[PDB]
Amino acid sequence: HHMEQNYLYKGTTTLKNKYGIKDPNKLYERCNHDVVKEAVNFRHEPPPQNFDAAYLSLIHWSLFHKTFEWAGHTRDTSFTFEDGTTARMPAMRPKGYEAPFAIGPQIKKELKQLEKTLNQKNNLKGLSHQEFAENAADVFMALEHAHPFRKGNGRANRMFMEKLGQAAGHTVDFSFITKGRMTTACIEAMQYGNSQPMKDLFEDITHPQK
Numbered sequence: 001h002h003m004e005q006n007y008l009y010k011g012t013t014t015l016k017n018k019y020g021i022k023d024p025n026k027l028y029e030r031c032n033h034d035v036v037k038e039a040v041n042f043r044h045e046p047p048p049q050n051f052d053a054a055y056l057s058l059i060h061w062s063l064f065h066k067t068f069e070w071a072g073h074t075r076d077t078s079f080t081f082e083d084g085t086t087a088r089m090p091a092m093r094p095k096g097y098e099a100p101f102a103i104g105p106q107i108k109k110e111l112k113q114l115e116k117t118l119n120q121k122n123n124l125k126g127l128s129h130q131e132f133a134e135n136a137a138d139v140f141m142a143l144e145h146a147h148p149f150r151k152g153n154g155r156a157n158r159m160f161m162e163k164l165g166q167a168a169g170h171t172v173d174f175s176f177i178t179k180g181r182m183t184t185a186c187i188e189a190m191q192y193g194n195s196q197p198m199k200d201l202f203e204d205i206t207h208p209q210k
Ligand SMILES: Nc1ncnc2c1ncn2[C@@H]1O[C@H](COP(=O)(O)OP(=O)(O)NP(=O)(O)O)[C@@H](O)[C@H]1O
Pocket: 094, 095, 097, 144, 149, 150, 151, 152, 153, 154, 155, 156, 179, 182, 183, 184, 186, 187, 190, 191
């Protein structure tokens, strides 16, 4: 259990962070604030040639480097903090639920499989509204199950989808999507094998580019 605990301040359930904030709720507030600002900037970046694991990590670094020392690094790789301790978390399972995220070697395997799919589908270009929304839901569910980071997966994955939409000719807009709406879609897909809420979600947030 040792490696996993090194993500957290001794005795707390709070992730080590660059603010040195020990209060979990204050960390949440400060992090969110910084991520929203960095997200505004990242929306202006030109699309990458390849939508791959490296790009997801670039997104994660861009959103979270002010918050976490390990921003951009996935939880299957050992990370050594400035404080000298080393953390890793190959297995994560949402509390109170049976189905885990990708475990250990599965994280890389799943990301590689998603890379191949996107390359084969030419990054979802040349698709109608309906076709893009359908395929984008599948991509997002794959990202969500992979859950490659210790924290910040939702925000990195959602930005990945915004940028994919930008490249593909579709605006993907999460601005009116509550935490509850998103959580319900994610849980139904991953815990219960029901993709309809996620399909509906991507239909609701996908629009022609203006
Ligand atoms: N029981 C669950 N099963 C599957 N996915 C879940 C479950 N609970 C939460 N999730 C999803 O896990 C993601 C959150 O991962 P996390 O590493 O906490 O990302 P985050 O960016 O830090 N937080 P957030 O802004 O709320 O998405 C969200 O997409 C949730 O909908």
